[PDB]
Design a protein around this ligand. Structure first.
Ligand SMILES: Cc1cc2nc3c(=O)[nH]c(=O)nc-3n(C[C@H](O)[C@H](O)[C@H](O)COP(=O)(O)OP(=O)(O)OC[C@H]3O[C@@H](n4cnc5c(N)ncnc54)[C@H](O)[C@@H]3O)c2cc1C
Ligand SMILES: Cc1cc2nc3c(=O)[nH]c(=O)nc-3n(C[C@H](O)[C@H](O)[C@H](O)COP(=O)(O)OP(=O)(O)OC[C@H]3O[C@@H](n4cnc5c(N)ncnc54)[C@H](O)[C@@H]3O)c2cc1C
Ligand SMILES: [Cl-]
Ligand SMILES: [Cl-]
Lengths: 496, 496
C-alpha cells in the first residue's frame, strides 16, 4: 500500500484531483496540494461535457448546492454558427437519437424529412426557447432519465477551483501556498520531493503534476515527450472578453461556437455575464488583429473591458504517467475548446487514476494500460475536432481554404469516405473511449454538411409510418416542454 | 430500388435469411430459395449465443411457440470441464457482473473472496441445480431484465430449419427443390442467375450464398479468397453421436465443453436426448481413434448408435459480399463450435445485410463497410477462441503441448500480458463487435487460470463491506432461486 499523494498545482486540475481522491479513499490516503501564490490559474468562463454530473455526484454534491456558487449556467449543447452556409446554424445537443424499427431518426430523417437537429432532437426547441432543463419544482424535464438528456454546465473556472479547494481542505487535504523551485529525483529518476521557497521539501509516494501548460514535473523534470497536434489543428492562441449581459432573459442554456475569419469564437453564458473568446491560429491573424475582430463582434466601443490573451500548448504527452508522476490537466494534454473537453480530460484522467491506483509494487503493465487509455481519450477527440474543420463548407479566407486541404489524422479519410455514402455508427467512429458517442459524430457531419448522397436503401423497402409518427411525437413533446419549462435564467435565479 | 433476392441453400442459413427478409420487408421484397433435395444440411443438435432471442422476437415468435417444435432446451452458459485437471470445471454463464463502488465483482473476488463463477454469478447455482430460467407461470427468474441474464438455447438444427421454411413459405417465399448445376455471370462478373436441373434459370437482383462449406457462389463462382485459421486453430474435423436420455431429470440447462485427448467434446442437451461431438485435429488423432474415444466416454458398447463424421472449413472469406452476392453461414466463415457462434454469425450477417441492403446503385462504400463488420465479427471470436487454448493449463498429450506453443493472432500477446497484471476490460478486449462482452473474456481467463498476480491495488485503499454484502446477496438470492424454480425438464415438459 502507498501511504501519500503530492499534488503540484491549484487550478481546476489540482483541486478536482484532491477532492476526488478524498471522496474515493477518505482517510486511507494522505493528500497535500502545493500551489503558487503568484502564478495564476486559467480563470475564464468554461463549458463542460455530459460526464461532469458524475464527478459532482461522486463528491456527494447536488447541482443546487454547487452551481450557484460558481456563477453557473446550463449547457444543453453547442450551437454551431457560420461554419458552412453564411448565417446558417445548427445544434450539437446532449441527447441520444431515438430508434424506430432498427434505424435511428437521422437515418429516417434522410429518407422521410426543417433542419436535421430541429426534426430529431427535443433539445433543439429547448435551446431556441432558452428553457432550463428543470421545472421550477426541481424535476428533470425528461419526466436514469438523466442519461437520455445528459446536459452539462457553464461556470467560472476560478470559482469552481475555489469551491473545490474548500471541499478538499474540509476533508483533510494539506494546503501549501508556495512556489516549487526545484524537483528532486532519486537514483532511478523517480521524483523524491518538491523543494519550496518557504516550506522546505515536500515528499510523498505519488506526485500529480497539475502545473498547466508548463508541465513542471512531467516535461521539465522527467523529459516526457510532448506530441504537438499543430500539423492537423493549427489554432494556438486565444483572446477572451467578459461581457455583462444587459438583459437577464437573454441567458442562453448552451454554448455557441461561431466561425470567425481565422478561427472561431465561443460564447459561454454565465449567471450575470457572457464569456467570449476568439480561438485562432497566429499564422493567419495577429493577436492584435484578433482582439479587434473579437471586440467588433461582441463589444464594439467597450474599451473599459480588458482583453485576456493566452497561448495554448496543443497536443499531448506520449505518456502522462512516468515513474511516480502522473500529469492531470493541461500538463498532460490539451486541444482547443471547440467541444469543451478540458475538464472532461481532467475527470477521466482522475477516475482512471483511481482505477489504476498504484500499490507498493508499482505495476508497469497497469501503468501502461493507464497511458493507452489517456492517449486514446485525446486522440479520439483530436480526430473528432479535425472532422469539424473538414466538415466546414466555408472557403472565404485563407484560413478556411487552408483548413480544406490540411493533412488529417490516420483514419479520418476513411470516416469521410464512409460519411459520403452513409452514416457513421458505433463500429466506424473512433473505437476507443473518447467521451463522444455515435450521435455526436453523426450530428456534426449532418449539421456541417457531410451528408450521405442518398438515404439508406433498406428504408425504401420499409413502412415509413412509425418514423413519421415519431417525428410528430418529437414536435409535439417539444411544443409541450417549452410551454411548461421556466427560462434558463428563471430557474437559476430560483436556486441562488 | 432492387426487388428480388435469390437464396441458394436451405440449411439454417438459408431459412434464417428468407424469414428475416420477409419479417423486415414483407411484400416489398420478392424472395426465392433454392435447395438441393439430395445434398443434406448440417443436422446436429446446436447451442446458441445470447443474441438469438432477438432473432425470434424480430420474427414475432415467442419461445413457448418455437422451442418445443425444435426439440429445444435451455442454455444458461457453458460448463468447461478438464481444461486443466481431471474432475475440475467452471462455468461461462450468460450473466453480466455486478458493479460495486466502481469495480466489478471479479475485481472484488480477487481482493476479498469458492470458485469465481460460484461467487459471482447466480447462473452458477441455477446450472448446478439444473433449474429452468422460468417459473412455471412463465415469468423470468430475474423478477429488459432479459439483458441482465441473457440465456440462450439448445435445439435440433433440422427442426429449426424445417420450422423456419414453414414460417417463410407462409409469408410468400418461393421454394424450389432442385440442384444448382451452373451459376451464370454477366460481362462484369456479376451473377446473372442460377441454372437448375429441372426448373431452368432462376434470376434476381441479389444472390445470397447459403450453400455451406462449399461456397458455390462466393468461392467457386466468384473466386472469393478464403483465409484459413488452421495455423492458430488446427481443429478440422468432428464426430457426433446422438445419445437418448434415460432419466428426463438428467436434463442440464447448459452446454458442456469437455477437453479430450486431442480436442474437445460438446454435450448439447435437447428435449429427449443429448448430442455429443468430438471436435479434433486430424494431425494428432485419426477419425477412427476419435470415434473410439468419443464412444468410450459417452456411450460405451452402444454400437447401435451411428457416428456422424464431418470435415470443417475453418476460417473466413476476405469478403463475404462480392458483386451482387453475399455469403451467409458456413459459406462465409466458420470457427469450431467452442463458444456456439455459427448461428450468431448467421444472424449478425443477416441483421447487417438489412442495414446495408443495396439500392439500384450498389454503393461500393456501403458494401465495403459490410465486409469490414463481417471480418471483425469473426476475427474477434477467433482471437477469443485462441485465448481458450492458451488458458488451458493441461499439457498431458502432444495436442495440449502443441496448443501451448502454437502461434497466436496479432493482439493476443498484449491481452495475455495485461491479464497477468490485471483484468481485461472494455478498452483492452477485442475492440470491434464480435458478440462477446468484457465479462466473457474475464470469465474465461479466471476459469482457465489466467489470473492477475495480485488484486487491484486500489481495492486495498477501500472499504470492503459493500462488496462483501453483495457477495452475500448473491449467495442468498441463489439459494432462493433454486428453491422456487422448476427443473429445466419440468418447465419444458409444461409447454410442449
Ligand atoms: C482559452 C482556454 C479556454 C478553455 N475553455 C475550456 C472550456 O470551455 N471547458 C473546459 O472544460 N476546459 C476549457 N479549457 C481548459 C481548462 O482551462 C483546464 O482544463 C482547467 O482549467 C485546468 O487547468 P490546469 O489546472 O491544468 O492548469 P492551470 O489553471 O494553469 O493551473 C496551473 C497551476 O499550477 C501552479 N503552478 C505552476 N507552477 C508552479 C510552481 N512552480 N510551484 C507551485 N505551483 C505552480 C499554478 O500556480 C496554478 O495553480 C480552456 C483552456 C484555455 C487555455
Ligand atoms: C460439427 C459442427 C457443429 C456445429 N455446432 C454449432 C452449434 O453448436 N451452434 C451453432 O450456432 N452453430 C453450430 N455449427 C454451425 C451450424 O452448422 C451452421 O451455422 C448452420 O447450421 C448453418 O449451416 P449452413 O446453412 O450455412 O450450411 P448447410 O447446413 O451445409 O446447408 C447447405 C445447403 O446448401 C444446399 N446446397 C449446396 N449445394 C447446392 C446446390 N448445388 N444446389 C442447390 N442447393 C445446394 C444444400 O442442399 C443445403 O441445403 C456447427 C457446425 C458444425 C460443422
Ligand atoms: Cl476545453
Ligand atoms: Cl458454432
Amino acid at each position: 500500500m502507498i501511504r501519500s499523494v503530492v499534488i503540484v498545482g491549484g487550478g481546476t486540475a489540482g483541486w478536482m484531483t484532491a477532492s476526488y481522491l478524498k471522496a474515493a479513499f477518505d482517510d486511507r490516503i494522505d493528500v497535500t496540494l502545493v500551489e503558487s501564490g503568484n502564478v495564476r490559474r486559467i480563470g475564464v468562463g468554461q463549458a463542460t461535457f455530459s460526464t461532469v454530473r458524475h464527478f459532482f455526484d461522486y463528491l456527494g454534491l447536488d447541482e443546487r448546492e454547487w452551481l450557484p456558487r460558481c456563477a453557473g449556467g446550463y449547457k444543453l449543447g453547442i450551437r454551431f454558427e457560420n461554419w458552412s452556409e453564411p448565417g446558417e446554424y445548427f445544434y450539437h445537443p446532449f441527447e441520444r437519437l431515438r430508434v424506430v424499427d432498427g434505424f435511428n431518426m437521422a437515418e429516417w430523417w434522410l429518407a422521410v424529412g426543417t433542419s436535421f437537429s430541429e426534426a430529431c432532437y427535443l433539445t433543439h426547441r429547448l435551446c431556441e426557447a432558452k428553457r432550463a432543463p428543470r421545472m421550477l419544482d426541481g424535476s428533470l424535464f425528461a419526466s436514469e432519465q438523466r442519461a437520455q438528456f445528459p446536459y452539462a454546465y457553464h461556470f467560472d473556472a476560478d470559482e469552481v477551483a475555489r469551491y473545490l479547494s474548500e471541499y478538499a481542505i474540509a476533508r483533510g487535504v494539506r494546503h501549501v501556498v508556495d512556489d516549487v523551485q526545484h524537483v528532486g529525483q532519486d537514483e532511478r529518476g523517480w521524483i523524491s520531493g518538491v523543494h519550496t521557497k518557504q516550506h522546505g521539501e515536500i515528499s510523498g509516494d505519488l506526485f500529480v503534476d497539475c502545473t498547466g501548460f508548463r508541465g513542471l514535473l512531467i516535461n521539465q523534470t522527467l523529459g516526457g515527450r510532448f506530441q504537438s497536434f499543430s500539423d492537423v489543428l493549427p489554432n494556438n492562441r486565444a483572446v477572451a472578453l467578459r461581457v455583462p449581459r444587459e438583459n437577464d432573459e437573454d441567458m442562453r442554456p448552451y454554448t455557441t461556437a461561431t466561425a470567425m475569419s481565422a478561427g472561431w469564437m465561443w460564447t459561454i453564458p454565465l449567471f450575470k455575464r457572457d464569456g467570449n473568446g476568439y480561438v485562432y491560429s497566429d499564422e493567419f491573424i495577429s493577436p492584435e488583429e484578433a482582439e479587434r475582430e473579437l471586440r467588433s463582434t461582441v463589444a464594439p466601443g467597450r474599451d473599459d473591458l480588458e482583453a485576456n490573451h493566452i497561448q495554448m500548448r496543443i497536443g499531448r504527452n506520449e505518456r502522462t504517467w512516468i515513474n511516480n508522476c502522473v500529469a492531470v490537466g493541461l500538463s498532460a494534454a490539451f486541444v482547443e475548446p471547440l467541444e469543451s473537453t478540458g475538464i472532461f480530460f481532467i475527470q477521466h484522467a482522475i477516475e482512471q487514476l483511481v482505477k489504476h491506483f498504484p500499490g507498493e509494487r508499482w505495476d508497469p503493465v497497469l501503468i501502461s494500460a493507464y497511458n493507452e487509455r489517456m492517449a486514446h481519450m485525446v486522440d479520439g477527440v483530436k480526430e473528432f475536432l479535425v472532422l469539424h474543420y473538414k466538415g466546414a463548407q466555408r472557403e472565404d479566407t485563407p484560413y478556411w481554404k487552408a483548413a480544406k486541404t490540411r493533412a488529417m489524422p490516420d483514419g479520418l479519410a476513411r470516416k469521410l469516405e464512409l460519411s459520403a455514402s452513409h452514416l457513421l455508427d458505433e463500429q466506424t467512429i473512433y473505437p476507443y473511449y473518447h467521451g463522444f458517442e455515435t450521435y455526436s459524430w453523426i450530428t456534426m457531419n449532418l449539421g456541417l454538411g457531410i451528408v450521405p448522397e442518398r438515404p439508406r436503401p433498406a428504408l425504401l423497402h420499409m413502412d415509413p409510418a412509425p418514423a413519421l409518427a415519431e417525428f410528430e411525437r418529437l414536435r409535439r413533446e417539444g411544443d409541450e416542454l417549452i410551454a411548461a419549462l421556466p427560462s434558463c435564467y428563471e430557474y437559476l435565479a430560483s436556486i441562488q
